[PDB]
Amino acid sequence: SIPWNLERITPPRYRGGSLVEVYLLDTSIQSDHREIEGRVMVTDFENVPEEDASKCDSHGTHLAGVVSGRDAGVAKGASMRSLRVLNCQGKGTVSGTLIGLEFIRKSQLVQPVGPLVVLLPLAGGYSRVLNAACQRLARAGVVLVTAAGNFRDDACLYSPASAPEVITVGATNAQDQPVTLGTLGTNFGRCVDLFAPGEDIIGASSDCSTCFVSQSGTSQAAAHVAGIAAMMLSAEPELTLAELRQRLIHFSAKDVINEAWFPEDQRVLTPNLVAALPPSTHGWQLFCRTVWSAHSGPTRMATAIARCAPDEELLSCSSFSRSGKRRGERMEAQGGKLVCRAHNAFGGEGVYAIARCCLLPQANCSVHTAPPAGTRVHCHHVLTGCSSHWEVEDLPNQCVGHREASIHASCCHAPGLECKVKEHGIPQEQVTVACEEGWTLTGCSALPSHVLGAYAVDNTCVVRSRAVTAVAICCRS
């Protein structure tokens, strides 16, 4: 009897949202539907373009029901407030959306409440101004959740999906696979934070005050994550955005997506995560996440930069290019904070910088560098990461690099942190080595036959080449 999607987000051990308010920006809604009656406040904010009734409020009503619906909702308690920015054809404007977001911020300033979650179940093309408004609203301390988009395309080409600091959600089906419908389907790529159920999702139907309908889309997926976030923020109201994102990643089902569904180049970039509620089992734990930069592009001196959130520490830095035409990476300070920078090679199509960003309070972390010597440097403190860059066209708390490369060790004073190094090598397109259960991968690199790059996938270090050895640095409390 439990809808498949609500079972899917139920953790393997289990036992809301009322302190939290969820704002919805959408079509008009049927606020008297019995799923949501008394739970949604209609603001009567409206900013919509001219067209060009059951249908007028179908989309919004269903999503309000996914978030908070008494029978089929994720966060059955939760209070919602709705703004109308989509017309009867489901069409809105970037300007109308901006005015809506501004309205939410003004409401908050005038009558402050607790944590706010804003669900943006909509998409247009990449918009500088829409992304900036989302970022500013996120920085003001509001949580934003958006749909990845339904075009079976790179979510970085769409807004608010592409917007920095917003939680962007793709859709998976009952078989935990990315939704595809012909040439259409869930968007993907490095701007997607995670996936959630978004096919055949039962919820309130505005056809009649007690009716239900199954709908599909990345908004339905985004609505699951908005609900999960509302519950998480009710339990732990002081979470920063970075703490909330790390929990969402951490409590997700991992490696359940067949990445064959995605276009080849997007496989490495797309997180293999399906959202789930936190378990009843939960003491401090080390949370880390992998942050891919935008591609540097092909300029000879191009650099890609991957950054962590202000309250996170960069524990390691790796890089990847598909050609293997690469000058590696280094950790450099910037506004008094370490970032991961990767360098393109001459004639390279470009590279990605890949940060490992972790929640480590009381950490004092530094970088120890040695210029080309093979070349070696150690934390003379625990080693959490090795990086190496070179300026040439081609070739024990210790990092070792190529004799012609500079080598960089990330060293942290973090008492109460235990770390170990696990190695694995083989004859090979890809070699792989995973940390043990209960340990957190902090760093991933290849021993110095021609490697494309290295990157952490959850707690597994992956090395890609054209006698390769993957090296994982793993830590725990």
Binding site: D26, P49, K91, T93, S95, L98, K106, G124, R128, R136
Partner: protein
């Protein structure tokens, strides 16, 4: 130093309406004066304009209904960071 942007997805563009985004620290009073200034300068050139909204609280700036002909002029106004042509968003 002010730049112009419009939607790469051509069918989703909505020409004739522009979001004028001012520099981060711009004050509401400055946004209002800048909007009035655009309208006056436009009017001297024979153009009708309409200020649909003045933004403050997240981004400073304004929404203006005008011909794109005026964009070179608008990009030279004080406080302008960039201008974006309005475009469509859709239920997902």
């Amino acid at each position: 130093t002010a730049t112009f942007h419009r939607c790469a997805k051509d069918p989703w563009r909505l020409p004739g309406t522009y979001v004028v985004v001012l520099k981060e620290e711009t004050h509401l009073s400055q946004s209002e004066r800048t909007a009035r200034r655009l309208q006056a300068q436009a009017a001297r050139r024979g153009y009708l304009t309409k200020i649909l909204h003045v933004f403050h609280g997240l981004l400073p700036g304004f929404l203006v209904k005008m011909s794109g002909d005026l964009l070179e002029l608008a990009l030279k106004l004080p406080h302008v960071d960039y201008i974006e042509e309005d475009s469509s968003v859709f239920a997902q």
